[PDB]
Design a protein around this nucleic acid. Structure first.
Ligand SMILES: [Mg+2]
Ligand SMILES: [Mg+2]
Ligand SMILES: [Mg+2]
Ligand SMILES: [Mg+2]
Ligand SMILES: [Mg+2]
Ligand SMILES: [Mg+2]
Ligand SMILES: [Mg+2]
Ligand SMILES: [Mg+2]
Ligand SMILES: [Mg+2]
Ligand SMILES: [Mg+2]
Ligand SMILES: [Mg+2]
Ligand SMILES: [Mg+2]
Ligand SMILES: [Mg+2]
Ligand SMILES: [Mg+2]
Ligand SMILES: [Mg+2]
Ligand SMILES: [Mg+2]
Ligand SMILES: [Mg+2]
Ligand SMILES: [Mg+2]
Ligand SMILES: [Mg+2]
Ligand SMILES: [Mg+2]
Ligand SMILES: [Mg+2]
Ligand SMILES: [Mg+2]
Ligand SMILES: [Mg+2]
Ligand SMILES: [Mg+2]
Ligand SMILES: [Mg+2]
Ligand SMILES: [Mg+2]
Ligand SMILES: [Mg+2]
Ligand SMILES: [Mg+2]
Ligand SMILES: [Mg+2]
Ligand SMILES: [Mg+2]
Ligand SMILES: [Mg+2]
Lengths: 55, 104, 136, 175
RNA sequence: CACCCCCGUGCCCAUAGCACUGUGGAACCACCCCACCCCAUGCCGAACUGGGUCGUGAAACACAGCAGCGCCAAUGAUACUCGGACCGCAGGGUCCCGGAAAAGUCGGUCAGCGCGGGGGUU
RNA sequence: AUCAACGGAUAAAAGUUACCCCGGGGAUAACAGGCUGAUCUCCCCCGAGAGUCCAUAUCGGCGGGGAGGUUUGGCACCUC
RNA sequence: UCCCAAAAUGUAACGGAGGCGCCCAAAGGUCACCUCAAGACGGUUGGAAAUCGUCUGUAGAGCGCAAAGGUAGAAGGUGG
RNA sequence: UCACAAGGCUAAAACCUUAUGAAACUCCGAAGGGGCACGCGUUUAGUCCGGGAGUGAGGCUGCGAGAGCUAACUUCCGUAGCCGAGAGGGAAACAACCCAGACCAUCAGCUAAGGUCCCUAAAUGAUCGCUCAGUGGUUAAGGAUGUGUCGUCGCAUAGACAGCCAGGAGGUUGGCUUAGAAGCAGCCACCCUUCAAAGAGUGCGUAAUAGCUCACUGGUCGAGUGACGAUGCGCCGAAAAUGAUCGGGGCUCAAGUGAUCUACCGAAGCUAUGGAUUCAACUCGCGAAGCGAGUUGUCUG
């Protein structure tokens, strides 16, 4: 998949923070490419709502 | 009433003991004294008494103790555990005992 | 009214009605619509209303029953020093639960005796009539 | 009655006034969804002892009976239905409504007719011919008079799942 | 095990249990009989124990039948619910997404897998 | 070893102060305010019953729904 | 010790209930043996309950004391 | 185990059908959580040894509970987030809520929550409806031929709902009660007669009669009309103290509202260009390490 951080981490729960951290995004507007596998696509599920996900 | 047998039965720690347990069955005027490796569902030696008995009915205990222990020599069994039954270790099954207890 | 022997004190919480939403022991039935607490005397009130309106004799099934002790601290005490001592008894009627069953009376009679009981009640209600054979 | 779809997904029908249902053959098992309006007219007419014809939007039409119904507690309305796909010569056990007939000579000296158990579950009829009601006479009945489950006239080829000394339609004193 | 059956003993710990019921006898088991001693009874060979039959397989056990009970138990739907969002002053309630019971209905089932020995297949 | 104030200040110990003093506290009470509204005040619903007769002329049991913030309080939020 | 305590541990309140500051020389060690409550039928004192017998009987009993967990193949009752 | 609703049954208990409550009940039992292994796949923290501390009054909201009155800008715990120690936009104003974490410069571009009649940046936008009450712009039981939308049932070309003419009957003051009760202050039953139709009968009435009228039928007309719920928006119920008001002007010939669509405005968030700092790695000078320099990345409440 592709990925964009289009929401924010403040006032968001600890784990969702640390998961934003993992997925490599550290600022809004950050985009990224992601490797369709259960642990990474399972890292995008849990912070789904903060992300504009492409394909 | 089945309490005595399942009692001593569990009281013989099956596997973790290492040693082999040794059944009996002197209720009828025929017995069965089996030797078992507990863990594996297999029965090793054994020495019955209903394939000819000489004649003795309870006097023959020592005989099948000696016969069993004889089978134990060959198969290579030197360690043992005495799985009695509802049988209160006294005469007959004591004979089977003492018999195997020397004639190993 | 009261339970006869027990433990003493309790608590409070809510979601929709366990059993039973269905109409046994009777032909017409009255159903909660709101998550109230219901005091003895409130039922007592509905019982006496309906009992009078039916005269002799009809048949009245008061399904709900107050097992829950509610307490109230003494007059003018600063909080603490204890828990309040059993003011009265409530029955935790959740929505949909059937509070009342009456039978041996016409539809008209049932409507009225119901409405009269309703105006005595802490919560909105609705009357209905059988078909609820979930079991019997 | 003419349902159509049956996926595990309900959004296709929810508001549109349809009930989730299942009809099982005991060999064949099929989920689906019926127009509410219909099944309302229906189940009102035929009740639990029903028997009506069910043609799935695929051509194949099978007869069936109503085994259970599942309600919204707060809206008091059908949301789901358990449906028995009937057999032929022996079915299952049928719950049927005790009624009452004629002015009892109980309501004329003090008391009233009280159907102490509204719904009587019998074993078998031969399905094709199910008793849908069950008239009991009461005119003989005085006040203090219980009718056990034995004394009910079954319509031949019918037995009683009931303990037949259990109190049914009994007439009660006044006050 | 060659085929059966019986005796012991296990893995299994009720879809493997119980009732009703039929079968079984010198070949294993059982009751049986005797007991002054080994041994034993808070009293009594009932039980432990000891010497042994016949007799009976009735009791008990083994095996078969059976779904009355017991136990096991769907799919369907729902309760609730992680997490996304909301309404209501409040008691409380809704929507989207995934997970998802319990009880009940369908049913399923008079278990299955071994080891050793005995005894039978004119 | 009721060192039981139970991690146990000394071997060994009570009161009083309106004659009172110091250092602090709005970390904490009495006044007032604030928040609440059980209690307190009023208004509404049902109507059993009273009114010869007739619920509502007037009164209104058993119970229900609100308002107000003038009572006694609750809380301790600015002011020691 | 139980509940609160939000199915890991933990978790406060002048929140909701109840025990302890011992006892046992056998109530311990081991060895061996025994199986409970309760109801139904019938039974000299009895006749609600006593003691005996038959049938049912997975715990509906017992465990020195509180309760929770536990336990009938014993921790339960008896003897060397 | 404790508690509990109607009935059976029995001498009450047990037991039988029906039926239900539980923090300190449990035949069962999720979602979730916790431990361990891997890393099957991303990312950056960790742990230990030693120096220096400060803190030990917390605060709100949501969810979960107790206490409390299912009171408190209440109290005590669990849990997430924020304030504390957080500036910036929004919520008129407003620690906490919603958006969002500010290295510096800019008279540059895009967005978030929230907004686009004038004060006030931005559509007096579009289309299908709703409400006419200033609802909008704060409460309830209760009430109501308000209005939209569904559904149920009923009556009707055998003439109905309404309107209008007439009958409304004989037993019979039905019995009971009563000082009298005769449809009509209270207890039991609703039977016959005549007909196209007239019911021990509904309200008013009388101390009780008598009296007025309805339930039924006929004509008359000439067609629909009546009841019961479900739901959208409103109406009433709605009374406090210095002067009013949604923040204001004002809004329905919507600036209110339910739905769907798009265009724009909006922050110290993102972006453009320039620049400095932190750390890091790479390259170089001198004499490894170290200091300075430079580039890339990175960071900087
Ligand atoms: Mg949620
Ligand atoms: Mg779902
Ligand atoms: Mg699933
Ligand atoms: Mg069998
Ligand atoms: Mg000292
Ligand atoms: Mg003085
Ligand atoms: Mg002086
Ligand atoms: Mg003086
Ligand atoms: Mg001073
Ligand atoms: Mg004062
Ligand atoms: Mg004060
Ligand atoms: Mg008052
Ligand atoms: Mg009166
Ligand atoms: Mg005050
Ligand atoms: Mg203060
Ligand atoms: Mg405080
Ligand atoms: Mg937890
Ligand atoms: Mg703490
Ligand atoms: Mg089950
Ligand atoms: Mg401190
Ligand atoms: Mg502190
Ligand atoms: Mg705290
Ligand atoms: Mg507070
Ligand atoms: Mg701020
Ligand atoms: Mg601000
Ligand atoms: Mg501002
Ligand atoms: Mg504030
Ligand atoms: Mg927007
Ligand atoms: Mg402008
Ligand atoms: Mg730059
Ligand atoms: Mg920053």
């Amino acid at each position: 998949m592709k990925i964009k951080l289009v929401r924010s981490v403040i006032g968001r729960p600890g784990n969702q923070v640390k998961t934003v951290q993992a997925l490599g995004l550290r600022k809004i507007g950050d985009s990224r490419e992601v490797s369709d596998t259960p642990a990474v696509r399972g890292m995008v599920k849990t912070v789904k709502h903060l992300l504009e996900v492409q394909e | 009433r089945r309490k005595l047998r399942t009692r001593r039965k569990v009281r013989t720690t099956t596997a973790a003991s290492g040693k082999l347990r040794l059944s009996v069955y002197r209720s009828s005027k025929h017995i069965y004294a089996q030797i078992i490796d507990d863990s594996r569902g297999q029965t090793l030696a054994a020495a019955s008494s209903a394939a000819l008995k000489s004649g003795n009915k309870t006097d023959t205990a020592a005989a099948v103790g000696k016969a069993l222990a004889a089978a134990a020599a060959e198969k290579g069994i030197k360690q043992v555990v005495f799985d009695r039954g509802s049988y209160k270790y006294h005469g007959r099954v004591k004979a089977l005992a003492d018999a195997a207890r020397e004639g190993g | 009214k009261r339970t006869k022997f027990r433990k003493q004190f309790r608590g409070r919480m809510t979601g929709d009605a366990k059993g039973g939403d269905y109409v046994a022991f009777g032909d017409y039935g009255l159903i909660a619509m709101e998550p109230a607490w219901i005091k003895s005397n409130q039922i007592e009130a509905c019982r006496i209303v309906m009992s009078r309106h039916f005269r002799r004799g009809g048949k009245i099934y008061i399904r709900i029953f107050p097992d829950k002790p509610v307490t109230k601290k003494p007059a003018e005490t600063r909080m603490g020093k204890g828990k309040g001592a059993v003011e009265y008894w409530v029955s935790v009627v959740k929505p949909g639960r059937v509070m009342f069953e009456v039978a041996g009376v016409t539809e008209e009679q049932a409507k009225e005796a119901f409405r009269l009981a309703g105006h005595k009640l802490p919560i909105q209600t609705k009357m209905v009539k059988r078909e609820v054979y979930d079991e019997a | 009655m003419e349902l159509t779809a049956k996926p595990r997904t309900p959004k296709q029908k929810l508001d549109e006034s349809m009930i989730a249902a299942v009809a099982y053959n005991k060999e064949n098992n099929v989920s689906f969804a019926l127009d509410r309006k219909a099944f309302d007219r229906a189940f009102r007419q035929q009740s639990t002892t029903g028997l009506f014809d069910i043609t799935v939007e695929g051509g194949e039409t099978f007869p069936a009976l109503v085994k259970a119904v599942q309600m919204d507690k707060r809206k008091r309305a059908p949301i789901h239905v358990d449906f028995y796909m009937v057999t032929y010569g022996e079915p299952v056990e049928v719950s049927v409504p005790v009624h009452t007939t004629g002015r009892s000579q109980g309501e004329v000296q003090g008391g009233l007719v009280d159907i102490v158990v509204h719904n009587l579950q019998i074993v078998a009829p031969g399905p094709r011919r199910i008793p849908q009601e069950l008239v009991v006479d009461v005119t003989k009945m005085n006040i203090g008079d219980h009718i056990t489950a034995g004394d009910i006239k079954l319509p031949e080829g019918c037995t009683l799942a009931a303990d037949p000394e259990l109190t049914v339609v009994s007439v009660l004193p006044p006050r």
